Amino acid sequence: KSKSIPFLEAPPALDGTMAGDKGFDPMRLSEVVPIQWAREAELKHARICMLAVVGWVAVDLGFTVPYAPQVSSLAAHDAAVEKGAFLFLLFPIAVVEVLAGIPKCFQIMNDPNAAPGGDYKFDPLGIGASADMQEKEISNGRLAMMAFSGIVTQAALTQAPFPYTYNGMSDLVPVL
Amino acid sequence: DMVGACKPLGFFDPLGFSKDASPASMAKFREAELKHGRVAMLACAGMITADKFHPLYDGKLSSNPLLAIAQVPKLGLLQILLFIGFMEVFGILNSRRPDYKPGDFLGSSQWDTTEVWDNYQLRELNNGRLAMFASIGMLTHAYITGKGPLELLD
Amino acid sequence: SEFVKPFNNDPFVGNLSTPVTTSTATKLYLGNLPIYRKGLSPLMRGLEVGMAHGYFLIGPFYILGPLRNSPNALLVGLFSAYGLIIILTLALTIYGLASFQDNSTGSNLESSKGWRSFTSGFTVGALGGASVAYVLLNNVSFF
Amino acid sequence: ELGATGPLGYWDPLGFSTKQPERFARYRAVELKHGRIAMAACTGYFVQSVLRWPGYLSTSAGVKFSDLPNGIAGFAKIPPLGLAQIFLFIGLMEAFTWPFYQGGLGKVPEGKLPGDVAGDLWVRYSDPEVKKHKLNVEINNGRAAMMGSLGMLMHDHILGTWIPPG
Amino acid sequence: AYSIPKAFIMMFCNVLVISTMTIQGKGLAKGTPHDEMVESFGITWLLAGTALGHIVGAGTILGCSTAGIL
Amino acid sequence: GVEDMVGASVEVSNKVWDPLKLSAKMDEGNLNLVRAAELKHCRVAMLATVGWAWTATGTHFEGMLSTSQGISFADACAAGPLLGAAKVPAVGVWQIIAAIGALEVFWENKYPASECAGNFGVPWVTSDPAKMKEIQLAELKNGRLAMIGIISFACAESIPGSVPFYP
Numbered sequence: 001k002s003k004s005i006p007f008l009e010a011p012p013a014l015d016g017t018m019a020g021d022k023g024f025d026p027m028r029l030s031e032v033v034p035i036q037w038a039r040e041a042e043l044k045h046a047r048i049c050m051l052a053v054v055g056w057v058a059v060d061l062g063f064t065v066p067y068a069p070q071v072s073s074l075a076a077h078d079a080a081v082e083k084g085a086f087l088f089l090l091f092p093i094a095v096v097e098v099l100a101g102i103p104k105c106f107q108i109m110n111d112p113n114a115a116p117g118g119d120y121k122f123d124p125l126g127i128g129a130s131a132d133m134q135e136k137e138i139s140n141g142r143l144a145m146m147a148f149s150g151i152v153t154q155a156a157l158t159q160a161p162f163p164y165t166y167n168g169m170s171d172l173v174p175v176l
Numbered sequence: 177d178m179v180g181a182c183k184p185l186g187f188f189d190p191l192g193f194s195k196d197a198s199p200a201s202m203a204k205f206r207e208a209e210l211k212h213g214r215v216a217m218l219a220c221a222g223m224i225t226a227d228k229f230h231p232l233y234d235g236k237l238s239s240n241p242l243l244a245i246a247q248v249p250k251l252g253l254l255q256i257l258l259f260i261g262f263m264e265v266f267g268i269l270n271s272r273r274p275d276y277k278p279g280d281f282l283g284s285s286q287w288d289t290t291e292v293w294d295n296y297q298l299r300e301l302n303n304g305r306l307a308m309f310a311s312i313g314m315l316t317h318a319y320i321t322g323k324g325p326l327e328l329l330d
Numbered sequence: 331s332e333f334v335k336p337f338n339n340d341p342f343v344g345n346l347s348t349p350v351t352t353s354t355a356t357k358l359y360l361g362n363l364p365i366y367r368k369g370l371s372p373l374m375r376g377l378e379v380g381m382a383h384g385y386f387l388i389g390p391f392y393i394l395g396p397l398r399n400s401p402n403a404l405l406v407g408l409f410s411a412y413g414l415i416i417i418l419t420l421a422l423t424i425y426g427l428a429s430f431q432d433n434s435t436g437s438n439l440e441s442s443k444g445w446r447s448f449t450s451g452f453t454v455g456a457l458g459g460a461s462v463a464y465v466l467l468n469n470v471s472f473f
Numbered sequence: 474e475l476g477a478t479g480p481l482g483y484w485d486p487l488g489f490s491t492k493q494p495e496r497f498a499r500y501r502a503v504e505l506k507h508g509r510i511a512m513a514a515c516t517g518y519f520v521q522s523v524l525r526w527p528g529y530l531s532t533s534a535g536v537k538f539s540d541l542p543n544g545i546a547g548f549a550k551i552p553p554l555g556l557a558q559i560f561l562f563i564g565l566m567e568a569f570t571w572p573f574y575q576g577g578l579g580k581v582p583e584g585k586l587p588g589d590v591a592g593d594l595w596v597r598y599s600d601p602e603v604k605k606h607k608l609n610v611e612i613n614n615g616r617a618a619m620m621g622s623l624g625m626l627m628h629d630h631i632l633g634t635w636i637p638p639g
Numbered sequence: 640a641y642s643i644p645k646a647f648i649m650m651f652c653n654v655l656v657i658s659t660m661t662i663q664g665k666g667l668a669k670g671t672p673h674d675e676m677v678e679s680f681g682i683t684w685l686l687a688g689t690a691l692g693h694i695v696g697a698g699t700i701l702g703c704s705t706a707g708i709l
Numbered sequence: 710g711v712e713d714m715v716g717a718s719v720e721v722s723n724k725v726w727d728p729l730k731l732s733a734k735m736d737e738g739n740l741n742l743v744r745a746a747e748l749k750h751c752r753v754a755m756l757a758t759v760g761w762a763w764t765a766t767g768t769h770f771e772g773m774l775s776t777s778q779g780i781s782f783a784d785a786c787a788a789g790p791l792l793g794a795a796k797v798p799a800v801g802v803w804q805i806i807a808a809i810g811a812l813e814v815f816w817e818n819k820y821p822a823s824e825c826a827g828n829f830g831v832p833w834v835t836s837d838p839a840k841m842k843e844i845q846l847a848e849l850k851n852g853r854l855a856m857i858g859i860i861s862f863a864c865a866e867s868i869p870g871s872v873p874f875y876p
């Protein structure tokens with residue numbers, strides 16, 4: 001029985017070696033998608049959403065680079081596209097993806113002796129790849145995914161400052 | 177025995193008939209059943225097509241089935257009667273044959289038939305029954321309203 | 331459920347017992363046509379065939395002839411039918427002469443006397459049928 | 474062991490029956506009774522939302538079946554004689570027709586099931602598996618119906634219509 | 640999705656397709672249990688079922704919008 | 710088994726009442742088929758009588774039957790049963806008959822009429838054979854009266870003054 005859903009049996013592929021494992025796979029994607037591919041995708045989305053959340057919050061608070069538009073994060077995409085300097089953020093993304101994801105993706109698909117998904121060996125400071133720091137990475141990334149989804153769909157809906165709620169801190173704190 | 181039995185009603189025979197009747201009587205009953213079904217299917221198809229598509233006779237004959245036949249010339253009726261009579265004398269000779277199988281102008285007792293043949297025969301029979309009811313309904317509607325089937329549906 | 335089987339239970343004869351070839355309707359119609367009917371003499375076979383063909387031979391010449399739009403359209407059609415029937419029975423006679431060279435049986439289409447009787451019946455029947463069709467088309471106002 | 478299956482198996486988050494297993498029969502009787510009245514009330518709400526009887530509710534009064542709303546106001550707009558008739562009908566049906574307790578409180582029939590109040594003339598499934606499944610769906614529908622009926626009652630108390638704002 | 644009628648129609652079409660579908664002779668309408676379908680086919684049972692459910696839902700929604708029923 | 714079947718109404722005769730001898734020459738399967746037809750007529754007649762009583766008395770839904778055709782239940786109820794009905798879209802009528810046909814196809818495949826003489830899969834209210842036969846006889850008598858009642862109602866409304874009362 002899975003630890004997360006106590007009325008279903010966990011898949012055999014999940015086991016307990018992977019970081020962030022909680023037996024949560026009710027519809028068993030792990031049989032139709034390789035777990036390493038799924039983990040690489042999970043970590044990629046998690047990292048992109050962490051960066052997106054912190055960048056959105058910074059730009060909304062007002063942290064702006066010189067010569068850039070002085071706009072909120074909701075209109076920042078359109079403003080940057082109009083002003084021009086937004087393809088040079090795609091260019092490093094282009095080289096990183098084409099020269100690290102495609103080879104790593106084909107290694108995960110084909111090679112048996114390949115690094116696990118989301119492992120680029122990126123440890124400049126040597127902080128450590130412990131299983132505590134992988135669990136923390138995964139938990140923060142999942143929280144950032146949900147938080148970014150909420151932030152975008154609330155900012156577009158309400159068109160308000162940082163809280164992205166209609167009333168403000170009053171909705172997070174009804175006592176106010 | 178025969179092929180007519182079907183799922184919705186089973187062997188439908190409330191009023192005897194089948195028992196206490198000769199094999200010749202049973203063959204006559206099935207021949208009449210198949211003839212009625214076939215003629216009724218022809219009548220239903222003819223009425224349905226001639227309601228909205230009647231190019232013959234310069235398109236002047238009415239869509240009413242009970243008046244189109246009145247307007248048809250005498251020679252056409254005589255030729256139709258001659259054709260039907262020729263088909264019926266062939267049926268009579270088939271009856272006189274010693275290996276008659278009620279309704280089977282194809283033979284079909286001289287080939288290795290299986291249950292699919294019986295199923296298709298039942299398909300013919302049930303379509304004939306449905307057409308038997310439908311054609312009489314069409315004629316009664318034409319007499320009552322004066323409109324044909326599709327004109328009534330309009 | 332096979333419906334095409336060997337002809338007369340002979341797989342090695344060049345034929346098949348299809349519904350078209352062997353069905354009861356085909357057997358009845360063919361066997362009851364005059365050329366195959368039982369008990370008919372060769373004269374009677376020829377007579378029936380003759381009237382059947384001479385009745386319809388007039389029509390093409392009458393309607394689609396050169397003198398269709400003429401007062402003598404039907405007479406010309408009948409003369410054309412008579413000429414075609416003359417050619418047909420000449421063909422029949424020479425066919426009998428070529429095929430049934432030596433024969434003494436008679437009363438059989440595959441014999442000289444029987445084929446001569448068949449040709450005679452065909453000639454008389456065709457002339458009579460063409461004449462009857464002429465009379466009917468003259469009195470077409472009846473129908 | 475009837476009641477207990479589903480997403481959550483036994484579910485006694487305060488341990489009532491665990492502390493007092495002798496009272497499980499009484500609690501089952503009360504649950505079934507509440508579920509039955511709840512199913513009746515929910516069906517009444519759904520069917521009154523669409524269909525209203527034609528005729529005078531009372532000739533003496535000026536109120537028809539069509540003027541009543543579907544809620545507390547609808548129940549309020551009934552003559553006191555009609556309300557008393559409803560009350561005594563419920564009283565007879567619950568005291569002499571379908572008494573859950575043979576005698577006093579906490580005295581449900583030991584031979585019969587806790588909610589076995591129907592007489593001889595009733596639908597009975599002579600199969601243990603089918604009977605168990607049908608009783609399980611009975612009690613579960615009772616739970617869902619009574620939660621939903623509390624929802625309807627609170628919505629109609631607050632706004633006036635059982636359906637909440639969309 | 641915008642309208643509650645549209646959501647209801649799409650959900651009903653998806654549920655109907657999932658109930659009445661059959662893969663290799665196995666289906667809920669044909670008395671195959673949910674657990675056996677889940678083990679035999681996996682999430683391919685939901686993916687194909689909901690894909691065809693969306694196709695038929697689109698067909699019926701567009702037809703009803705054309706007819707003015709919606 | 711004409712005597713085996715339940716339905717002998719003591720009011721008309723202590724035994725089976727078959728004046729024209731239509732069951733004298735009949736098969737057991739066809740007897741079951743005829744009983745199934747009798748029961749289906751009975752059950753349709755009771756429901757039709759109750760529907761007539763509800764629609765004629767003024768009972769109707771609160772709504773519109775077709776948004777694209779400007780129809781309402783109140784108009785059908787005000788018109789009357791014979792008319793109001795005529796006042797329904799043909800598409801809705803075909804949908805009703807299609808649902809009934811789906812139910813009948815499923816039930817006849819599951820419970821063939823000749824095999825089961827109207828005994829579908831609904832659960833039974835009593836297992837005592839005496840009460841079982843009494844309930845079956847009561848069903849048949851009520852359904853016979855329902856047939857007579859629905860035809861009487863039809864003749865009353867279609868032809869005025871054709872039944873003494875017509876409540």
Ligand code: CLA
Nearest residue numbers: 178180181185186187188193194205206208209212305308
């Ligand atoms: C007139 C046409 C006709 C004929 C000759 C037959 C003949 C036959 N049917 Mg029947 N049948 C017919 C129409 C006909 N059927 C129709 C339209 C249906 C659809 C309901 C059926 C449905 C049916 C089933 C389901 C079965 C048969 C079977 C049979 C066979 C046994 C019963 C028998 O002897 O009936 C004798 C019939 C007659 C002598 C015809 C006249 C009957 C009375 C006297 C008058 C007409 C009745 C009534 C008043 C209808 C007209 C009123 C109104 C609708 C206009 C036999 C070959 C059974 C079979 O083949 O088993 C092997 C079988 O299983 N039939």
Ligand code: CLA
Nearest residue numbers: 386387388389390391392393394395396397398410411414
């Ligand atoms: C094949 C094409 C063709 C067709 C359709 C026609 C048609 C015609 N030509 Mg001809 N013609 C043709 C080629 C053709 N021609 C050629 C190649 C030449 C050059 C030599 C001519 C030169 C020519 C002349 C000089 C004249 C005609 C004329 C005619 C007309 C009358 C001829 C006649 O008496 O026929 C007689 C035909 C028959 C006795 C029998 C025809 C066959 C029958 C109907 C077939 C039935 C088959 C049946 C369905 C089988 C199954 C039956 C079973 C189921 C029972 C007619 C319009 C005459 C006219 O007046 O024109 C307006 C005319 O003067 N044609």
Ligand SMILES: CC(=O)O[C@H]1CC(C)(C)C(=C=C/C(C)=C/C=C/C(C)=C/C=C/C=C(C)/C=C/C=C(\C)C(=O)C[C@@]23O[C@]2(C)C[C@@H](O)CC3(C)C)[C@](C)(O)C1
Nearest residue numbers: 512513515516595596614617618621624625635636637834
């Ligand atoms: C007597 C005899 O002889 O035979 C009988 C014997 C026997 C056994 C009794 C039989 C039976 C069966 C019977 C009578 C069964 C009856 C069952 C019944 C009557 C069951 C109601 C359920 C209601 C529920 C769950 C309500 C949920 C309600 C919910 C989820 C809500 O909250 C409502 C709501 O959320 C919505 C939906 C919309 C939202 O905007 C919000 C609101 C809050 C408004 C037989 C066999 O048929 C015949």
Ligand SMILES: CC(=O)O[C@H]1CC(C)(C)C(=C=C/C(C)=C/C=C/C(C)=C/C=C/C=C(C)/C=C/C=C(\C)C(=O)C[C@@]23O[C@]2(C)C[C@@H](O)CC3(C)C)[C@](C)(O)C1
Nearest residue numbers: 489493496499500503623624625626627628629630631632
């Ligand atoms: C053996 C032993 O020792 O103990 C055993 C035996 C013993 C003691 C008998 C037991 C018991 C019985 C107990 C304790 C039962 C408790 C029952 C309980 C607690 C029942 C609440 C109902 C609330 C309702 C219906 C609320 C409606 C609310 C409605 C309709 C409202 O809308 C109210 C409203 O305010 C709102 C929400 C908003 C406002 O805008 C409008 C208004 C003002 C209208 C136990 C538990 O078995 C323990």
Ligand SMILES: CC(=O)O[C@H]1CC(C)(C)C(=C=C/C(C)=C/C=C/C(C)=C/C=C/C=C(C)/C=C/C=C(\C)C(=O)C[C@@]23O[C@]2(C)C[C@@H](O)CC3(C)C)[C@](C)(O)C1
Nearest residue numbers: 755756758759831832851854855857858861872874875876
């Ligand atoms: C002196 C006299 O009468 O003069 C005149 C008066 C008048 C009025 C003018 C006339 C009339 C008309 C008449 C006589 C009309 C009669 C009408 C009559 C007799 C109407 C019965 C309805 C029964 C129903 C609807 C039963 C439903 C029953 C249902 C749906 C159930 O609950 C049963 C069931 O769920 C259970 C409980 C258990 C489950 O397993 C499932 C089943 C389905 C089995 C006449 C003809 O002119 C005669």
Ligand code: KC2
Nearest residue numbers: 530531532533534551552553554555556558559560562563
């Ligand atoms: C719970 C179910 C129930 C049953 C089993 C039941 C049985 C009987 C019997 C048979 C034993 C008789 C003889 C009878 C007679 C009358 N009932 Mg009564 N009745 C029930 C319910 C209601 C309700 C809700 C109302 C009501 C009424 C009246 C009036 C008044 C009419 C008028 O006002 O002109 C009269 C004469 C109304 C009322 O009290 O009106 C002031 C009203 O609202 N009844 N009622």
Ligand code: KC2
Nearest residue numbers: 651703707708774775776777778798800801802804805808
């Ligand atoms: C036997 C009962 C019955 C069932 C089980 C049933 C089920 C479903 C389902 C499946 C869950 C759907 C999805 C559906 C959809 C529609 N039904 Mg339908 N329906 C039934 C009965 C009637 C009647 C009597 C009418 C009707 C109609 C419509 C219209 C069009 C409305 C309009 O015209 O605006 C639409 C779109 C009306 C109609 O077609 O009116 C011309 C109409 O009168 N239905 N119906």
Ligand SMILES: CC1=C(/C=C/C(C)=C/C=C/C(C)=C/C=C/C=C(C)/C=C/C=C(C)/C=C/C2=C(C)CCCC2(C)C)C(C)(C)CCC1
Nearest residue numbers: 259377381382383385386454455456457458459460461462
């Ligand atoms: C089968 C069939 C068919 C066909 C048909 C046909 C093929 C027909 C034909 C027809 C014809 C084609 C007919 C004919 C007739 C003829 C006649 C009717 C004749 C007569 C003649 C006569 C009468 C003669 C006389 C005479 C003589 C003999 C000699 C001397 C002179 C005289 C004149 C005296 C069809 C397709 C429809 C389809 C269905 C089936």
Ligand SMILES: CC1=C(/C=C/C(C)=C\C=C\C(C)=C\C=C\C=C(C)\C=C\C=C(C)\C=C\C2=C(C)CCCC2(C)C)C(C)(C)CCC1
Nearest residue numbers: 365390391395407408409410411412413414415416417418
């Ligand atoms: C039936 C039959 C058949 C057939 C069929 C078909 C399908 C078809 C046919 C066809 C044909 C078979 C045709 C024909 C045609 C013909 C023609 C087309 C002719 C013409 C002619 C002419 C035109 C002539 C003229 C003339 C004269 C008359 C004389 C003098 C000279 C002249 C030249 C002037 C068979 C054999 C199989 C078998 C048996 C039966």
